[PDB]
């Protein structure tokens, strides 16, 4: 009947004392839990073991700004002076043994974002279709979006300054250094590429829009 409850997301200001909560099921309020940290395309990594009295031991690769605290069924992971590198998903876990049978349960995980970082406007790099793709009667236009922070953007495309939505696919952002990047693709036929005066990648970031265009001519 083991249950671990975690909020799905949390945000903290850069340099603040951040606190994440994992809550045990009532009947397991005295249990020792484990915290894990996970980044994109990587396995989780142990952060610390945390007991009901708040005592804790921290893992390989964890700096001492991380600490644990406890109150009742609640288990807290605190990060002093939180840094952008601390953005990750934090997952709590708990084990038990029941009639010689081991059981383990993970919480849902909490995605942590660090706010209050220096803002940075996107750089756009655009590429026309290759001659190789055009020979296959297709044209993919590529818009690489880089050097931006925070991570939220919206991307639209225009053809001769008019909205085009069919054939647009935009990636999620990923973290490079402390900033972010994403890509957007406009899939056309070769005839569409050849028939327009311009195509424009339009990126909105923090409510401000930047544009870069391709001219088939």
């Amino acid at each position: 009947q083991l249950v671990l409850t975690q909020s799905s997301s949390a945000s903290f200001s850069l340099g603040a004392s951040a606190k994440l909560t994992c809550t045990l099921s009532r009947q397991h309020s005295t249990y020792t839990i484990e915290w894990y940290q996970q980044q994109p395309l990587k396995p989780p990594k142990f952060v610390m073991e945390l007991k009901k009295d708040g005592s804790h031991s921290t893992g390989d690769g964890i700096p001492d700004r991380f600490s644990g605290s406890s109150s009742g069924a609640h288990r807290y992971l605190s990060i002093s002076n939180i840094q952008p590198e601390d953005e990750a998903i934090y997952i709590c876990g708990v084990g038990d043994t029941i009639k010689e049978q081991f059981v383990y349960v993970f919480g849902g995980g909490t995605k942590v974002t660090v706010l209050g970082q220096p803002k940075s406007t996107p750089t756009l790099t655009v590429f026309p279709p290759s001659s190789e793709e055009l020979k296959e009667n297709k044209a993919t236009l590529v818009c690489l979006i880089s050097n931006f922070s925070p991570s939220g953007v919206t991307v639209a495309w225009k053809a001769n300054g008019t909205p085009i939505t069919q054939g647009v696919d935009t990636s999620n952002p990923t973290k490079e250094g402390n900033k972010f990047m994403a890509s957007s693709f406009l899939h056309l036929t070769s005839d569409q590429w050849r028939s327009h005066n311009s195509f424009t990648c339009q990126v909105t970031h923090e409510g401000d829009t930047v544009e870069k265009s391709l001219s088939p001519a």
Partner: protein, 212 residues
């Protein structure tokens, strides 16, 4: 210098069977429990159970009682996860993890094995060169299935200034782009090549970037 190294990505059709492996090195395999953990795309971790590496006795979490089988080959220091009668929602990255039991925690993890369960066919990428102080060159890795692909530049010798972007997915085909930024004085006088690997189709593509 303990490591857990898993088998590569796999694409399987619904109803088929897959066997994923996890090879331990740097310690005595039979002295620590090996656990299995499922992570569906965009979802949390789910403990599947564990296997006693001495006795070979598996323990399954309730949601994994049925189609799942843990086994061992102790002489190869390897644990296996077999999933039978595959379902679409078996699509996930599966991790093996060692448990130590001063402390109780998962102390070593495999890198993950990404399983895709789909009726769509394996498709190698089409790779296209992208040409226009610094210049940015690119490669478009178009229309592959399943994930993932890896991209390097000049066989890994070009690492600074490389950005590989997340894939997009549309109608059972993924596409991504990778870029490298180099001094304009060095191109095209010095050749630049992207190297793309698509493990699930056992394909490798080199593409030289030449002026358009």
């Amino acid at each position: 210098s303990i490591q857990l190294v898993q088998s590569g990505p796999e694409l399987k059709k619904p109803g088929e069977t897959v066997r994923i492996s996890c090879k331990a090195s740097g310690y005595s395999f039979t002295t620590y429990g090996m656990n299995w953990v499922k992570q569906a795309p965009g979802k949390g971790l789910k403990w599947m159970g564990w296997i006693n590496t001495y006795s070979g006795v598996p323990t399954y979490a309730d949601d994994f009682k049925g189609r799942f089988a843990f086994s061992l080959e102790t002489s190869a220091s390897t644990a296996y996860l077999q999933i039978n009668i595959l379902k679409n929602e078996d699509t996930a990255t599966y991790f093996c993890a060692r448990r130590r039991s001063y402390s109780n925690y998962f102390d070593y993890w495999g890198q993950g094995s990404t399983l895709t369960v789909s009726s769509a066919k394996t498709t190698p990428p089409s790779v296209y060169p992208l040409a226009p102080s610094m210049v940015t060159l690119g490669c478009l890795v178009k229309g592959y299935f399943p994930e993932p692909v890896t991209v390097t530049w000049n066989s890994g010798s070009l690492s600074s200034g490389v950005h590989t972007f997340p894939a997009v997915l549309q109608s059972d085909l993924y596409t991504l782009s990778s870029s490298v930024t180099v001094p304009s004085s060095t191109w095209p006088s010095q050749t630049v090549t992207c190297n793309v690997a698509h493990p699930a189709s056992s394909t490798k593509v080199d593409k030289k970037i030449v002026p358009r």
